[PDB]
């Protein structure tokens, strides 16, 4: 039979809290693992997300001086790399976020402001999320153009700690491309395909998502460019991905979905999409083979 899936945007209230691994439950190797103040701070963010309901304004947070310094460090270094690494759509939208959502090295943008910007541009919106959801639940948000977004900041001891998303990753990696209509349609269609899909199908869609939205490369005017959010918020891997040291294959959902998604290391392979439109077309053909 078909599993429950959300039928309208407010139904994400019933699956956005189905958190498998809560935001304050740190990994043993997390830089903040022995930091009680940071643990308390993470519980604060997790509770904001748990208490959030669709329709609410996303709670605005006063970030600490330390958190803002962490963001600034990350922001300054990445912005040196974006002109020579990021895809044209990313570079087109990033200055709009500086102008309208307060992206600055001494200011962390609020999720509510970014959500309002996205709603106007592509109809995307943000939902704060306490922690990790099943791939079924996470992808289901995209069906309604909702992106489940972490609100906390990485621990200050390691401004380059990358295996878990934080709000730096969300704001610098994901948001500029959600502001692009062709990328928003691509993303939404991943979510639509997942709704009520088999567990097998959901997993394959999640892997395709990983190797496009999170670690995708594209070809523009004959050059390799980056559009994956995980690359766009990782200083070292952003550089690695466009070096001669990286293994690169064409995006092809039936092949790409066999690839293991790595967590604590650079990816072993990156997949190059021809355009967001072509990636979208390829996903359309693939989803017909795994769902109906």
| Of 100 and 145, CB closest to ligand UVF | 145
- Rounded CA-CA distance 144/163 in Å is 27
Q: By C-beta, is 86 or 229 nearer to Fe ion?
A: 229
Residue 151 or 156 having the CB closest to ligand UVF:
151
Name the binder of 143 from ligand UVF, Fe ion, none, CB < 5-8 A by kind: none
Choose, from 89, 180, 214, 237, the residue flagged as catalytic. Answer: 214
Which 3 state secondary structure label does DSSP give 166? coil
- Is 155 a known active-site residue? no
The residue ranges that bind ligand UVF (CB under 6 A) are 129, 131-133, 135, 138-139, 148, 150, 163-165, 169, 206, 209, 214, 230
User: Is residue 126 near Fe ion by the rule CB under 5 A?
Assistant: no
Which CB atom, from 206 or from 226, has the smaller least distance to ligand UVF?
206
CB of 148 to ligand UVF, least distance (A): 6
Q: Say whether 214 counts as a known binding-site residue.
A: yes
| In contact, 73 and 153? CB cutoff 8 Å | no
Residue 47's φ and ψ, nearest 5 degrees, are -70, -40
Alpha-carbon gap, residue 185 to 285, rounded angstroms: 15
Burial class (CB in 10 A: 0-12, 13-18, 19+), 196: middle
Catalytic member of 85, 174, 180, 234: 174
Q: Which residues contact 206 (CB under 8 A, 6 or more apart)?
A: 135, 138, 139
Give the whole-angstrom CA distance, residue 262 versus residue 276.
Answer: 23
Q: Which of 125, 140, 233, 273 is catalytic?
A: 233
Length reported for the chain: 292
Q: Is 148 annotated in the active site? A: no
Q: Is 238 in the site for Fe ion (CB under 5 A)?
A: no
Catalytic residues: 169, 174, 214, 233
Interface residues with Fe ion (CB under 5 A) are 165, 229
């Amino acid at each position: 039979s078909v599993p429950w899936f959300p039928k309208k945007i407010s139904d994400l209230d019933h699956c956005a809290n189905r958190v498998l691994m809560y935001g304050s439950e740190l990994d043993a190797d997390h830089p903040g693992f022995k930091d009680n103040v940071y643990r308390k701070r993470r519980k604060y963010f997790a509770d904001l997300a748990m208490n959030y309901k669709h329709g609410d304004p996303i709670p605005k947070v006063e970030f600490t001086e330390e958190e803002i310094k962490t963001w600034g460090t990350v922001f300054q270094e990445l912005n040196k790399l974006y002109p020579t690494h990021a895809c044209r759509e990313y570079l087109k939208n990033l200055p709009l976020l500086s102008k309208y959502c307060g992206y600055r090295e001494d200011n962390i943008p609020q999720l509510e402001d970014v959500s309002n910007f996205l709603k106007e541009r592509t109809g995307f919106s943000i939902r704060p999320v306490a922690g990790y959801l099943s791939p079924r639940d996470f992808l289901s948000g995209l069906a309604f153009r909702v992106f489940h977004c972490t609100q906390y900041v990485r621990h200050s001891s390691d401004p380059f700690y990358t295996p878990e998303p934080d709000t730096c990753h969300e704001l610098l990696g994901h948001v500029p491309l959600l502001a692009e209509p062709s990328f928003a349609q691509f993303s939404q269609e991943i979510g639509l395909a997942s709704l009520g899909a088999s567990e097998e199908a959901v997993q394959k869609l999640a892997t395709c998502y990983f190797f496009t939205v999170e670690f995708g490369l594209c070809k523009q005017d004959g050059q390799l460019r980056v559009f994956g959010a995980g690359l766009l918020s990782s200083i070292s891997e952003l550089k690695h991905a466009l070096s001669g040291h990286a293994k690169v294959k064409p995006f092809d959902p039936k092949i790409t979905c066999k690839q293991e998604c790595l967590i604590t290391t650079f990816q072993d392979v990156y997949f190059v999409s021809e355009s967001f439109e072509d990636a979208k077309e390829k996903m359309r053909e693939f989803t017909k083979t795994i769902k109906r």
